[PDB]
């Protein structure tokens, strides 16, 4: 199947700036389905598991400080090629390089000790599966119809 699930984290900078709704709307308007979502305040150990691949990189600690600064909204988006699509929608890692039209391109720019970039998006299907399991239990993910689902029945 082409339908995939990916993890998105609306980071502290977006939450603090009141951009939760605007970000979610971009995904809904694209046709992506929110199958799981919740506001949580990530603890350092959970944050380090999420970013375990960067544990030896210079920006690691600053990244942990940043992602755990305030509560965030973690959500699982489902849809055709969702992983690559959401990555495209997010834009370049550093918002200053992100193209206008992308989430980081339109909303991000300023940085702290960390490169604040509005949201996190799984980089691959493998990472998505791992990340989703880190933040969500199966009972927190749902299968339900969005309004236009019937239109695409093959």
């Amino acid at each position: 199947s082409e339908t995939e699930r990916t993890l998105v984290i609306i980071k502290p900078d977006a939450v603090v700036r009141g951009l939760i709704g605007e970000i979610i709307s971009r995904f809904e308007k694209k046709g992506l389905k929110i199958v799981g979502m919740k506001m949580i305040w990530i603890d350092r150990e959970l944050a380090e598991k999420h970013y375990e691949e960067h544990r030896e990189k210079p920006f690691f600690k600053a990244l942990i400080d940043y992602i755990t600064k305030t509560p965030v909204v973690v959500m699982v988006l489902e849809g055709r090629y969702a992983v690559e699509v959401v990555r495209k929608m997010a834009g370049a890692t550093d918002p200053k390089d992100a193209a206008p039209g992308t989430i980081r391109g339109d909303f991000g720019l300023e940085v702290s000790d960390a490169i604040c970039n509005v949201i996190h998006a799984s980089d691959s299907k493998e990472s998505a599966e791992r990340e989703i399991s880190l933040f969500f239990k199966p009972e927190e993910l749902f299968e339900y119809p969005r309004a236009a689902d019937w239109f695409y029945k093959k």
Copy 2:
């Protein structure tokens, strides 16, 4: 303190229509703070507890069918006189009577066996406290700063 918390449920009709983000944005833009939020699928037992006061009213069964139709997003909003303010933003119970500019006035109209009206908003501080405790555990509610909080320091 004038600051209070109220419960909002983004109902199945809003979730199915992809209006989660637009609704959240209206609250964020107003200055209200999201201190708790999660997508859940309410079962009949939980639904009947939430609407226990209407247990004997005619529209009860249809109301339970409606609120449990698909997952919903339950969220807690915090702010100055949040309870009455959110009710004002919501608009008339039946969307056809809701004024343009309100959530129900701009997004609602069509009904099923139930009067589908986009969101639920606690009708009082007493109801808010009861409803918040019904859907959220204390650890799921947070105290953190929104960008402009410092501006209002009294």
Copy 3:
């Protein structure tokens, strides 16, 4: 049935100002269905038939000049109590008196010899039936499903 059809004319001032899309979106977002629509350039004869009830009123000539100034978009909206709902969304006849949130309240203000007010909305089911028949042939009106129609199945 509570479902009805009403006629809306996006007037010359709205067409010239590039507000066709924004007006249509307000109706779509409300849940109303566009069952007919076309851009036409009304001539004096057709205009006088549409406004036949004002044939003797003072503002008649200026009203005809206004509605025939440039092409307009005539459209038929279908929905629960569509006639009164659309009138409510339109706002006060003179835009200066229209409430913020309404179409006239948000988009209208300036006037010519005529009280330019962005759109026309049938004032009753009787007027709607007459107006729809004046601008549309039966084959130009359609019955089809909007995405969320299934949700409201009674």
Copy 4:
């Protein structure tokens, strides 16, 4: 002259999802002029004439089923280099590959047996002339001033 006319079809997926207004607004905001527009329900024979160049391609029938699934809105846009400009605004054929900011990039993703992609846009001046004639009679196209036309007088 650099002024051209191109044909746009707001496809069934966009109509069903209630995106007619949002799409039209993008063209109006760009400065393009709507010189013709109407909601019609395309018949199979007309659809096959429109897509005659793909009659021998594997996806042909699915394309006909898709474009005739529900009514659509056909419109003619006029403006400087309108053909190439509207094509750029539409984005990649498959919405998953379309850049954020484009119509397909922001609104499309899910597919049926056909690659549902929100709108159709003439691919060349030659195709535009042919397509416009297929859906519109000369009496349905208009020459009138948009608000800012005077500003660009050379």
Copy 5:
């Protein structure tokens, strides 16, 4: 003439929250013309002159502290019955009482020692003339055409 000019001050809370553009857009969309505008940082002397009528009221000191907290944007709007129209668009003095759809109703809520309410709007033609002369020199106010001005030629 029904045309008049009124003074609007986009207050510190709106500037700090990044709402300058959204506020200006509401006036532009209504059809009002910006004939003067500038970002300035009001000192106590200028602030007290502007609010001279409240010199003896209880909230005076806090009001001066508020309006001089950060730079503001002062602007002059011109249009049909602009004074009362802008007051209508602004909404109730205390944002919690302001109706959804109005500027204060959609953007304001939280308060400091002062009733932060997003913008200031002249309360009468007499006040407008005084306020405009206080903040602007004649050479900073312009007479020019907005795109659709020609449409309203009487």
Copy 6:
């Protein structure tokens, strides 16, 4: 420091079309800070100083006629790598070539004797310093906190 200041001119075509607010909002939403702004009607000599680098180019006079056609809004934006960022946000010089998502890509297209392109953005730090000094005195530029500034403290 990475923080820079750049000059933006909302050109006559944007002012006439009522796009001042929408343009400003894009900068505010990106996180850029407006440290100076005012509506002025540029005189030919000032315009020629601003565009002194093009004095010998064929389109020079038409450019002067265009930039001095009606009042404009000049503003100084401050932020991380502001010069290159604002240039990216503006898009290609000729709006027809500008990517959807950029200011010129979304709002520009039509041209007069001059290539009307909505806004001007300094092309380099050197040009920015020179251009800012041409339109602003030091007393017209301010240092103040935007809501989220504290979040990025390093």
